Symmetry: C2
């Protein structure tokens, strides 16, 4: 059979990975993951609309001494194939730079961006992560006081 199999699904990581690749829609959630994981390497995949947010994340990362790859851009946030291709490129680029353990944080972007990132993570044998939060009812944004680093799959 050629059918895919997911032997380890779910769970929580509360720190390890030294590299993280993000799909990007906002800057605050990747900045939180950066503070939790303290990676030495970072990859970023964004859209035209979220490019500025991704550049804000990279600017904070560089001032902490993190090696940043990207932001790479996808032309269509609805297309899972473009996000798969760009995340797979960054995972390869991080590995060729010496990065060992890498995770893909697929929280940001539209669902096809996250699903393409997941497929690229699975094809590379790397873990996929998701930042679970409750919604801040009074500030109308994710409540990062509630943030938990959940694990989607560990190949």
């Amino acid at each position: 059979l050629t059918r895919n199999r997911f032997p380890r699904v779910g769970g929580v990581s509360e720190s390890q990975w030294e590299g993280v690749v993000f799909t990007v829609s906002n800057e605050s959630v990747p900045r939180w993951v950066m503070a939790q994981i303290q990676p030495a390497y970072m990859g970023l995949v964004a859209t035209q609309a979220s490019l500025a947010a991704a550049e804000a994340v990279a600017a904070v990362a560089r001032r902490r001494g993190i090696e940043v790859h990207g932001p790479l851009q996808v032309a269509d946030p609805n297309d899972p194939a473009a996000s798969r291709s760009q995340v797979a490129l960054l995972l390869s680029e991080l590995r060729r730079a010496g990065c060992r353990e890498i995770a893909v944080d697929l929280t940001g972007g539209k669902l096809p961006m996250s699903l393409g990132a997941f497929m690229a993570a699975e094809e590379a044998g790397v873990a996929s992560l998701y930042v679970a939060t409750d919604f801040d009812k009074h500030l109308k944004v994710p409540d990062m006081r509630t943030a938990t680093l959940r694990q989607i799959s560990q190949p």
Copy 2:
């Protein structure tokens, strides 16, 4: 090592899928998908919070002659494992009930629910779909008029 040989594309057919399983957050998108695919069977996975919306979808479907399975429930929308288990059961239940071509619509529910549904679809060799819209910047809502059925993955 998993591999995804067929990723992306656009789907336009009222006869390709006999059944659709939804992860549920709202009733509007599943009702749109029902109209487009016109399935004979439907499965539904919900949380305690989205159970009422899933029941609204089921009620509409029953009155159109669709055989509805579920809603099954997951305790936590942030955990992929429960959604994966419940979608896997529904895919099996639909196959046992006579449904030969099933899709999983990933659009609804929290992202971990969708990711669990994707993993169950892949393990069952069934296709995953997404309802793409452009943002209706006038109403600050997804623009349902722009809705197109996207293919996420088509397992071999």
